[PDB]
Write a protein that binds this DNA or RNA. Structure first.
Length: 52
DNA sequence: AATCTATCACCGCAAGGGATAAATATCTAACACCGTGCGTGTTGACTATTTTACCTCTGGCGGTGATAATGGTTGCATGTACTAAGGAGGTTGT
Protein backbone atom coordinates (compact mmCIF):
# COMPACT_ATOMS: atom_id res chain seq x y z
CA UNK A 1 0.00 0.00 0.00
CA UNK A 2 3.06 2.40 0.06
CA UNK A 3 3.32 1.92 -3.78
CA UNK A 4 -0.36 1.15 -4.56
CA UNK A 5 -1.74 4.67 -3.81
CA UNK A 6 -0.06 7.56 -5.64
CA UNK A 7 -1.72 7.04 -9.03
CA UNK A 8 -3.99 4.15 -7.86
CA UNK A 9 -6.12 6.71 -5.87
CA UNK A 10 -6.02 9.53 -8.54
CA UNK A 11 -8.47 7.27 -10.47
CA UNK A 12 -10.70 10.03 -8.92
CA UNK A 13 -9.81 11.82 -12.28
CA UNK A 14 -12.36 9.29 -13.77
CA UNK A 15 -15.29 10.05 -11.29
CA UNK A 16 -15.73 13.87 -11.75
CA UNK A 17 -17.63 14.42 -15.06
CA UNK A 18 -20.74 14.08 -12.84
CA UNK A 19 -19.81 17.18 -10.73
CA UNK A 20 -17.00 19.65 -11.77
CA UNK A 21 -18.10 21.36 -15.01
CA UNK A 22 -20.34 18.59 -16.44
CA UNK A 23 -20.24 20.46 -19.82
CA UNK A 24 -18.10 23.34 -21.26
CA UNK A 25 -18.43 26.26 -18.76
CA UNK A 26 -15.28 26.71 -16.47
CA UNK A 27 -16.10 29.88 -14.49
CA UNK A 28 -13.96 32.55 -12.68
CA UNK A 29 -13.37 31.15 -9.15
CA UNK A 30 -9.98 30.43 -7.54
CA UNK A 31 -7.87 27.51 -6.02
CA UNK A 32 -6.55 29.60 -3.01
CA UNK A 33 -3.37 28.00 -1.74
CA UNK A 34 -0.89 27.01 1.11
CA UNK A 35 2.81 28.30 0.78
CA UNK A 36 5.58 27.82 3.46
CA UNK A 37 8.93 28.54 1.51
CA UNK A 38 12.65 27.48 1.24
CA UNK A 39 14.75 26.57 3.33
CA UNK A 40 12.51 26.52 6.46
CA UNK A 41 13.37 23.85 9.12
CA UNK A 42 9.74 22.54 8.84
CA UNK A 43 9.90 21.81 5.02
CA UNK A 44 9.34 18.15 3.78
CA UNK A 45 12.18 15.68 2.86
CA UNK A 46 11.04 16.08 -0.78
CA UNK A 47 12.86 19.51 -0.61
CA UNK A 48 16.16 17.64 -1.10
CA UNK A 49 15.03 16.41 -4.61
CA UNK A 50 14.44 12.63 -4.78
CA UNK A 51 14.07 9.49 -6.99
CA UNK A 52 10.57 7.88 -7.53
C1' DA B 1 23.19 -7.11 3.01
C1' DA B 2 24.42 -6.41 -1.26
C1' DT B 3 22.75 -6.48 -6.58
C1' DC B 4 19.17 -4.55 -10.18
C1' DT B 5 15.31 -4.41 -13.93
C1' DA B 6 11.27 -3.18 -14.85
C1' DT B 7 7.17 -1.67 -12.29
C1' DC B 8 3.58 2.03 -11.35
C1' DA B 9 4.28 6.04 -11.81
C1' DC B 10 7.35 11.22 -9.52
C1' DC B 11 9.73 13.67 -11.31
C1' DG B 12 11.32 16.07 -15.60
C1' DC B 13 11.31 20.70 -15.79
C1' DA B 14 6.99 23.66 -19.25
C1' DA B 15 3.61 26.47 -18.04
C1' DG B 16 0.67 29.79 -15.34
C1' DG B 17 -2.04 30.97 -11.37
C1' DG B 18 -2.40 33.64 -6.72
C1' DA B 19 -0.27 36.31 -4.09
C1' DT B 20 1.37 40.10 -1.39
C1' DA B 21 3.57 44.16 -1.11
C1' DA B 22 4.54 48.32 -3.00
C1' DA B 23 2.45 52.94 -3.64
C1' DT B 24 -1.18 55.45 -3.37
C1' DA B 25 -5.28 57.28 -1.16
C1' DT B 26 -8.60 56.99 1.80
C1' DC B 27 -10.27 56.35 6.42
C1' DT B 28 -10.28 57.20 11.62
C1' DA B 29 -8.48 58.21 15.89
C1' DA B 30 -5.53 60.56 19.16
C1' DC B 31 -4.84 64.48 20.82
C1' DA B 32 -4.69 69.52 22.26
C1' DC B 33 -7.10 72.88 22.69
C1' DC B 34 -11.27 75.11 24.75
C1' DG B 35 -15.50 75.40 27.65
C1' DT B 36 -18.54 73.72 30.83
C1' DG B 37 -20.09 72.44 35.35
C1' DC B 38 -19.28 69.83 39.11
C1' DG B 39 -18.00 68.09 43.66
C1' DT B 40 -12.29 72.19 44.44
C1' DG B 41 -12.25 74.68 49.37
C1' DT B 42 -13.72 77.11 53.89
C1' DT B 43 -17.02 79.14 56.24
C1' DG B 44 -21.45 79.55 58.39
C1' DA B 45 -26.33 78.54 59.80
C1' DC B 46 -29.02 75.21 59.81
C1' DT B 47 -31.66 71.08 61.97
C1' DA B 48 -32.16 67.26 63.75
C1' DT B 49 -25.89 62.70 63.87
C1' DT B 50 -25.54 61.29 68.35
C1' DT B 51 -25.67 61.23 73.29
C1' DT B 52 -28.14 61.74 77.86
C1' DA B 53 -31.93 63.18 80.20
C1' DC B 54 -36.72 63.10 81.03
C1' DC B 55 -41.78 61.82 80.30
C1' DT B 56 -44.49 58.53 79.36
C1' DC B 57 -44.72 54.13 73.68
C1' DT B 58 -44.66 49.04 72.79
C1' DG B 59 -44.81 44.79 74.06
C1' DG B 60 -42.72 41.76 77.70
C1' DC B 61 -45.75 37.67 80.16
C1' DG B 62 -48.19 36.52 84.00
C1' DG B 63 -52.34 35.52 85.39
C1' DT B 64 -56.71 32.89 85.19
C1' DG B 65 -62.82 33.96 83.91
C1' DA B 66 -68.52 31.13 86.86
C1' DT B 67 -77.02 31.55 85.47
C1' DA B 68 -74.84 26.81 83.88
C1' DA B 69 -72.51 23.51 80.94
C1' DT B 70 -70.48 16.45 84.80
C1' DG B 71 -71.21 8.08 79.83
C1' DG B 72 -66.60 9.76 75.61
C1' DT B 73 -65.05 8.99 70.93
C1' DT B 74 -62.79 6.40 66.98
C1' DG B 75 -63.14 4.13 62.10
C1' DC B 76 -60.96 0.95 59.14
C1' DA B 77 -54.23 -2.68 60.73
C1' DT B 78 -56.71 -6.90 57.30
C1' DG B 79 -58.88 -10.16 54.01
C1' DT B 80 -53.42 -13.31 50.68
C1' DA B 81 -49.41 -17.30 51.32
C1' DC B 82 -46.89 -19.34 53.59
C1' DT B 83 -45.86 -21.91 58.35
C1' DA B 84 -43.36 -21.84 62.98
C1' DA B 85 -44.43 -21.18 67.57
C1' DG B 86 -47.17 -20.91 71.85
C1' DG B 87 -51.21 -21.78 73.66
C1' DA B 88 -55.33 -24.65 75.36
C1' DG B 89 -57.32 -29.26 77.85
C1' DG B 90 -59.02 -33.76 77.83
C1' DT B 91 -57.11 -38.13 77.72
C1' DT B 92 -54.85 -42.48 76.50
C1' DG B 93 -51.19 -43.38 77.30
C1' DT B 94 -45.35 -42.60 79.12
Amino acid sequence: PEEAIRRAATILAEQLEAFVDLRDVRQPEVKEEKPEFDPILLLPVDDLELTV
